[PDB]
Ligand binder design. Structure first.
Ligand code: NA
Ligand code: NA
Lengths: 303, 302
């Protein structure tokens, strides 16, 4: 539960008829951010300010949205909302908020013509609150599917999931993940819990079938996604937040196979607090971020 | 003149009262893209698909826009326009256009409350045409300034410029640059032509003043030059990204300081997917540097 971390509120906007939506994490306490874009087909906005050799931005929130490339318009909706509320970097003549975002492709379920837009991004911001939030097919996970080797028609439902890992000394690492993976999702024993299905409903085993020669028939296959946020209540430097984002992908690798494919836009954002007493080695935090991400992947499909 | 390269149209949308705008390069022939974001304060959209290890996207156009972070909305306005015209990658249930973009900060001149938006991005696409285009304080260069050590009040006008370099065998490399640099612009002799001014009126020499201890008082200081270089050669993705990287050498020759903590300096590069012209990428990149440097000067000679 991402809101276990100080200062974070989460809001969804959900369109259950079109099967799309967006989710925003809003930061009421200043954060130090990082990012790792590992998939080969990602669409994002504002990620350059999240690398270690860029200046320290003022990140107002981070958004996970559907709508493919179109859905980044909801991030601009959030930017406009935050400016009206008086948040963002103060340049005297204006305040400039920043809402980095990454997308999934969810246009092949429901209505392809409806995508998160300026208004939907505002709605998610308005709805953002502390405490527990809903998981499953809501917000950015509304139109998510898993296991697209044979097309969306033989896929399993995806979703939005969350988990918190507790360490010593009050340290926490939490994740919030939208699972829309090309590949199958497995538990810790290696059983398939969501994935590509044969016509009658048994799991095919995507990787096994690909080794035998079955070819990718998903909508994006002709050009040659799991997105999420990992957050800690530790203080981080920019270099450490980017290292945490990099290590968190290991958790995706343990749950999802194949992962980081040519049709995946896999992206992890990471945050720590600018002002906190708590510190810990980044390799430990990163390992816990991997565990949190893995658990959040499973959460997405059991809710 | 960027439209010297096959298939490119350029459109501006200009608000001369608010002192902002945006410019789009539209690609009617398919391109191979690359990018190099070198400044430490850049705001961009869709750049991940432009690196060599990403799949080959279908770039519909590239936008250079004012409005700081707000101005990326104009890119989505262009995406909406192109979808209505039936352009973009075909997924059966829809067509998905892609309009990568980078911004300058132009809120401290004119009206801070007006920025390129959905409507303005569409207007730039509507205006896009072949042949010569206007340069100076137009489109994405409308609100551009150069030399902000002492703030915008002691700056020089910037703008949008373009240049074409001709090589052997019909090869061309062209650039289109918006100069909004923190630093000063020098000509090829090394004279300051645009830059920070003392109150008493002369160019201060930004770098010299910084070495003496003068502190950056620009609006972003508590925490740009953007452009496109294009060739009629066929490139791979790796080569287009190398061309973008080498083009920054041209910015370094014209502008000083460059790639600062207040600069969002970004170069996009394109080659043609279908072309019979090839040349070594280190030569093309050197030419891209020359074109970029000449375009920087062009921006202020208008
Ligand atoms: Na996807
Ligand atoms: Na700028």
């Amino acid at each position: 539960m991402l809101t276990d971390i100080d200062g974070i509120r989460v809001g969804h906007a959900t369109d259950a008829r079109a099967m799309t939506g967006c989710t925003i994490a809003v930061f009421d306490e200043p954060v130090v951010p990082g990012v790792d874009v590992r998939g080969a087909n990602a669409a994002t906005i504002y990620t350059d300010l999240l690398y270690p050799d860029s200046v320290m931005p003022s990140v107002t929130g981070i958004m996970l949205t559907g709508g493919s490339a179109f859905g980044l318009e909801a991030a601009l909706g959030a930017v406009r909302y935050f400016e009206e509320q008086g948040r963002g970097y103060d340049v005297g003549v204006a305040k400039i908020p920043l809402v980095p975002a990454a997308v999934i492709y969810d246009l092949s379920v429901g209505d392809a013509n409806v995508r998160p837009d300026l208004a939907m991004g505002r709605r998610a911001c308005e709805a953002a609150k502390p405490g527990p939030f809903e998981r499953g097919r809501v917000g950015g996970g509304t139109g998510a599917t898993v296991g697209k080797l044979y097309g969306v028609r033989q896929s399993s439902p995806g979703g939005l999931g969350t988990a918190t890992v507790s360490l010593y000394g009050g340290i926490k690492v939490s994740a919030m993940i939208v699972v829309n993976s090309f590949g199958d999702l497995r538990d810790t024993a290696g059983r398939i819990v969501a994935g590509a299905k044969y016509e009658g409903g048994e799991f095919a085993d995507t990787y096994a079938r690909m080794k035998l020669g079955d070819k990718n028939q998903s909508a994006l296959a002709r050009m040659g996604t799991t997105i999420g946020i990992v957050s800690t209540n530790c203080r981080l430097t920019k270099v450490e937040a980017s290292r945490m984002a990099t290590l968190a992908h290991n958790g995706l690798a343990r749950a999802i196979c194949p992962i980081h494919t040519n049709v995946d836009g896999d992206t992890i954002f990471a945050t720590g607090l600018q002002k906190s007493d708590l510190t810990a080695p980044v390799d430990l935090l990163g390992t816990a971020a991997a565990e949190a991400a893995m658990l959040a992947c499973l959460d997405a499909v059991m809710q």
